[PDB]
Amino acid sequence: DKQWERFLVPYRQAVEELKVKLKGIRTLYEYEDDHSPIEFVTGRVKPVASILEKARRKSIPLHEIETMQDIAGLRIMCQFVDDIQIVKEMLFARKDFTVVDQRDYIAEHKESGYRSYHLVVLYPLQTVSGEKHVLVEIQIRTLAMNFWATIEHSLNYKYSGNIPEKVKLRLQRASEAASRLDEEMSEIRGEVQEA
Amino acid sequence: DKQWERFLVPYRQAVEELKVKLKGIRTLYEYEDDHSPIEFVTGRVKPVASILEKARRKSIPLHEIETMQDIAGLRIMCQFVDDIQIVKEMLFARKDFTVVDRSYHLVVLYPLQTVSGEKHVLVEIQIRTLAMNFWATIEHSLNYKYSGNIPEKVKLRLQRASEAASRLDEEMSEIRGEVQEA
Amino acid sequence: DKQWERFLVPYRQAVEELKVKLKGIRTLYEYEDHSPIEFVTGRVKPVASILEKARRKSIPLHEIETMQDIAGLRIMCQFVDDIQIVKEMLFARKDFTVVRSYHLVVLYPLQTVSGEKHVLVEIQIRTLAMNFWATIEHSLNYKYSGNIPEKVKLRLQRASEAASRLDEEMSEIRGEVQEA
Amino acid sequence: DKQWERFLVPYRQAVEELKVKLKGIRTLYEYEDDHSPIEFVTGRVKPVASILEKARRKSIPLHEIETMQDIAGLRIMCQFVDDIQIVKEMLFARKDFTVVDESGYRSYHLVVLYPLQTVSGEKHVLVEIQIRTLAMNFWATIEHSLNYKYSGNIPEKVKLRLQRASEAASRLDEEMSEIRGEVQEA
Numbered sequence: 149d150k151q152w153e154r155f156l157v158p159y160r161q162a163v164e165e166l167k168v169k170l171k172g173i174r175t176l177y178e179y180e181d182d183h184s185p186i187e188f189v190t191g192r193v194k195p196v197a198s199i200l201e202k203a204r205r206k207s208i209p210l211h212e213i214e215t216m217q218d219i220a221g222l223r224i225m226c227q228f229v230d231d232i233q234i235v236k237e238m239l240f241a242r243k244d245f246t247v248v249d250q251r252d253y254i255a256e257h258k259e260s261g262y263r264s265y266h267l268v269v270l271y272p273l274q275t276v277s278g279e280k281h282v283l284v285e286i287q288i289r290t291l292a293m294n295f296w297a298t299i300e301h302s303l304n305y306k307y308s309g310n311i312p313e314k315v316k317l318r319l320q321r322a323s324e325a326a327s328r329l330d331e332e333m334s335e336i337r338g339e340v341q342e343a
Numbered sequence: 344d345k346q347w348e349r350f351l352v353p354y355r356q357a358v359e360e361l362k363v364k365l366k367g368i369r370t371l372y373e374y375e376d377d378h379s380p381i382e383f384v385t386g387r388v389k390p391v392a393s394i395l396e397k398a399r400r401k402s403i404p405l406h407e408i409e410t411m412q413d414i415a416g417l418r419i420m421c422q423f424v425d426d427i428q429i430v431k432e433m434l435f436a437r438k439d440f441t442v443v444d445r446s447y448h449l450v451v452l453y454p455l456q457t458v459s460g461e462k463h464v465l466v467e468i469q470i471r472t473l474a475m476n477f478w479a480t481i482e483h484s485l486n487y488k489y490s491g492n493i494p495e496k497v498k499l500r501l502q503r504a505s506e507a508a509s510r511l512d513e514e515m516s517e518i519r520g521e522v523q524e525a
Numbered sequence: 526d527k528q529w530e531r532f533l534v535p536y537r538q539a540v541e542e543l544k545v546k547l548k549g550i551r552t553l554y555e556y557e558d559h560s561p562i563e564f565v566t567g568r569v570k571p572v573a574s575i576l577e578k579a580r581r582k583s584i585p586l587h588e589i590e591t592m593q594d595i596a597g598l599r600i601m602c603q604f605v606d607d608i609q610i611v612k613e614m615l616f617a618r619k620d621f622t623v624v625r626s627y628h629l630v631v632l633y634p635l636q637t638v639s640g641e642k643h644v645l646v647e648i649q650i651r652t653l654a655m656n657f658w659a660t661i662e663h664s665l666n667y668k669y670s671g672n673i674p675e676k677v678k679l680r681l682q683r684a685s686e687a688a689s690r691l692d693e694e695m696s697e698i699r700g701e702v703q704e705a
Numbered sequence: 706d707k708q709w710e711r712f713l714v715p716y717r718q719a720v721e722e723l724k725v726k727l728k729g730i731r732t733l734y735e736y737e738d739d740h741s742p743i744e745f746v747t748g749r750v751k752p753v754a755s756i757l758e759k760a761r762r763k764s765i766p767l768h769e770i771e772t773m774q775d776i777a778g779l780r781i782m783c784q785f786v787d788d789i790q791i792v793k794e795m796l797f798a799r800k801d802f803t804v805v806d807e808s809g810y811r812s813y814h815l816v817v818l819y820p821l822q823t824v825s826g827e828k829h830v831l832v833e834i835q836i837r838t839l840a841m842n843f844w845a846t847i848e849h850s851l852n853y854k855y856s857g858n859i860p861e862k863v864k865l866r867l868q869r870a871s872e873a874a875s876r877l878d879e880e881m882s883e884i885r886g887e888v889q890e891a
């Protein structure tokens with residue numbers, strides 16, 4: 149419980165770095181006056197309780213926690229669905245890490261009407277001890293989907309996994325609303341490029 | 344071109360100080376596991392081009408641009424429509440400045456402590472919902488791309504997007520209400 | 526003890542606000558002359574120190590709001606004379622009230638969620654040289670648990686003296702430069 | 706002019722990334738409850754003027770300023786003189802860049818090539834990394850200010866007090882390494 153804080157140190161650092169790196173993209177794009185594919189970036193280090201519980205369910209032995217793919221997380225947000233593929237292509241082309249193949253959250257991507265996506269990278273962190281490779285999960289969401297996802301996450305923690313029938317249905321409604329807001333935005337960015 | 348950067352100095356510092364003041368509000372809620380009415384906060388100093396451009400329209404003489412209310416601006420994003428009202432109530436109650444006579448704005452007179460002494464600078468505070476702000480952002484961009492004259496086909500999709508954002512908020516408020524049926 | 530986090534909220538916020546305000550002084554100059562401020566730091570006194578200081582000074586938990594340094598800011602200067610200037614700036618500001626080294630305490634009026642709340646804040650002023658020594662004295666006085674062994678204490682005293690010297694030297698550079 | 710502003714984009718970004726990478730070092734130690742070789746890290750993009758000033762001085766051809774090694778500069782500050790070689794070596798050991806080609810040994814400097822990922826692919830950039838002791842750097846600062854104020858020619862009355870100050874700073878370093886020394890016998 150105090151060897152935890154020590155264990156995670158490399159995970160913060162990689163977060164702080166990919167954070168500043170990813171944030172450079174928007175800045176570069178701000179000089180073209182061209183539309184930035186990136187609205188903003190956030191990151192987080194998975195909490196101990198989140199990590200242990202996820203181990204539980206994924207039957208990940210405790211000496212193999214390093215296999216967990218989201219101890220270090222970043223989240224890239226965009227205005228437009230179509231921005232995601234752009235961002236994905238940028239991340240594949242980058243050479244300061246490498247994309248780890250994987251096929252997870254296939255239902256989550258789909259249920260969200262493909263407004264939430266993600267890919268895992270192996271990042272080569274320079275340690276005092278030398279070099280330490282760490283998994284980093286990079287989410288890619290629309291602003292709209294992320295709004296909805298945030299609310300779902302709160303209530304889901306508020307009722308500890310038991311969202312009342314009444315509230316679930318209003319939350320489903322909210323989801324479709326968000327999904328629709330994107331619909332109309334994609335049609336905006338669509339109508340524009342008819343230039 | 345740089346006597347400007349001298350004019351703008353007390354505005355940047357007003358924005359920076361209020362930025363960290365208002366960001367404190369969400370911080371005071373984080374340990375409650377009670378809901379933060381403020382989701383996040385941004386600020387900007389008005390671009391020197393925007394100032395002259397605006398001084399044109401509203402017929403503001405150069406010697407009175409200090410009466411322009413938004414040289415310094417903050418913007419407060421809220422999750423729920425109901426939050427905007429809670430935040431406005433908070434701004435009116437704060438003593439570290441004074442208020443001057445889905446969205447909202449007010450103007451404060453912020454007493455900026457300087458090296459020369461005390462200086463009151465006007466600051467515009469905006470309060471939006473996330474959804475509202477997303478739509479308003481695209482509207483602003485386009486309103487620049489098409490230089491103030493947006494094509495008709497685009498204008499419609501903008502109107503529909505606007506209405507899409509409002510449903511999202513309305514749905515959001517009913518979650519909020521139904522949850523408060525506890 | 527989760528009370529601590531809840532308790533220290535207003536102190537972090539006050540330190541955060543003072544931090545941005547004091548760092549504004551250096552900004553104001555480096556556009557107009559020599560800034561009397563080099564850099565600024567701030568810290569919320571950690572829970573362990575609060576408790577140990579409280580024992581030392583024999584303060585009960587229902588008064589630890591009387592401890593002057595639960596919020597602390599530290600302003601660093603180049604020149605001894607600079608400190609005096611900052612001293613007066615601080616005394617001239619209205620967004621709070623006052624109640625080679627130097628420290629004052631302010632009562633900062635924090636706008637809380639439920640109303641106002643005046644918290645004490647300690648502001649230290651130091652030359653860059655004095656601070657560097659002080660850092661070490663603190664670190665060693667830590668690492669050695671408050672009994673620093675003499676073979677080290679005398680060395681610290683020399684560093685103390687070395688630094689004092691260098692400020693003497695720097696006061697003079699300022700003195701000669703001002704003969705213009 | 707905005708030829709510059711856009712030209713300086715990759716430099717601003719590279720300073721920001723290395724700034725975060727280097728601040729990890731002090732973090733990693735100050736967690737371990739060890740002593741940290743790095744006290745703090747700063748960084749600068751060379752002002753447009755200083756690139757033109759340094760232009761004429763070193764017989765530049767403005768078509769090749771990208772040969773100028775300190776457009777993007779970082780500076781690491783250490784408590785002790787012994788830390789500097791400790792940093793210098795951590796710096797030689799890293800794989801996210803490659804190291805390339807008065808005050809005594811209280812100040813070092815080196816130049817890295819930084820493999821910057823940009824929107825249109827890779828761009829290697831030279832970044833200068835000065836390592837100094839706190840004391841060293843404090844005198845350098847006043848030195849740099851006056852050398853600038855008096856346009857490269859300092860009044861002999863002031864140069865003297867400078868040399869004196871420089872000796873006071875150097876002695877301070879000597880007392881500090883004696884401290885670290887007697888603590889290294891624990």
Ligand SMILES: Nc1ncnc2c1ncn2[C@@H]1O[C@H](COP(=O)(O)CP(=O)(O)OP(=O)(O)O)[C@@H](O)[C@H]1O
Nearest residue numbers: 190191192198202218220221222223285286287301
């Ligand atoms: N990649 C990421 N970027 C930013 N924030 C993230 C993130 N992943 C999670 N978070 C935040 O971290 C908290 C807890 O962990 P999780 O959301 O469950 C990450 P996950 O691995 O994708 O889901 P999981 O833990 O069920 O496996 C949440 O507040 C969430 O919003």
Ligand SMILES: Nc1ncnc2c1ncn2[C@@H]1O[C@H](COP(=O)(O)CP(=O)(O)OP(=O)(O)O)[C@@H](O)[C@H]1O
Nearest residue numbers: 385386387389390393397413416417418467469483
């Ligand atoms: N109060 C505020 N807080 C934060 N950002 C603001 C703001 N007012 C404007 N902005 C942002 O500043 C950018 C453009 O600035 P401006 O056009 O000069 C101010 P404005 O919103 O147009 O008011 P204006 O119409 O009276 O001129 C936009 O990105 C806009 O979203």
Ligand SMILES: Nc1ncnc2c1ncn2[C@@H]1O[C@H](COP(=O)(O)CP(=O)(O)OP(=O)(O)O)[C@@H](O)[C@H]1O
Nearest residue numbers: 566567568570574578594597598599647648649663
């Ligand atoms: N304005 C400030 N006042 C006090 N400490 C400050 C400070 N700014 C930074 N610090 C630092 O915060 C760190 C924590 O030290 P503390 O545990 O609070 C002991 P202290 O407060 O310095 O002495 P004290 O308990 O006798 O009052 C120290 O390294 C200290 O120098």
Ligand SMILES: Nc1ncnc2c1ncn2[C@@H]1O[C@H](COP(=O)(O)CP(=O)(O)OP(=O)(O)O)[C@@H](O)[C@H]1O
Nearest residue numbers: 747748749751752755759775778779780833834835
């Ligand atoms: N590598 C570095 N890291 C951080 N700050 C630096 C730096 N090199 C210079 N600076 C700082 O940048 C400011 C001005 O630097 P400049 O004069 O523009 C380039 P210079 O290195 O000082 O001269 P030079 O052309 O001989 O190389 C000074 O405050 C200086 O201390």
Ligand SMILES: [Mg+2]
Nearest residue numbers: 217218221285
């Ligand atoms: Mg995950």
Ligand SMILES: [Mg+2]
Nearest residue numbers: 412413416467
């Ligand atoms: Mg405005």
Ligand SMILES: [Mg+2]
Nearest residue numbers: 570594597647
């Ligand atoms: Mg103290």
Ligand SMILES: [Mg+2]
Nearest residue numbers: 775778833835
């Ligand atoms: Mg140099």
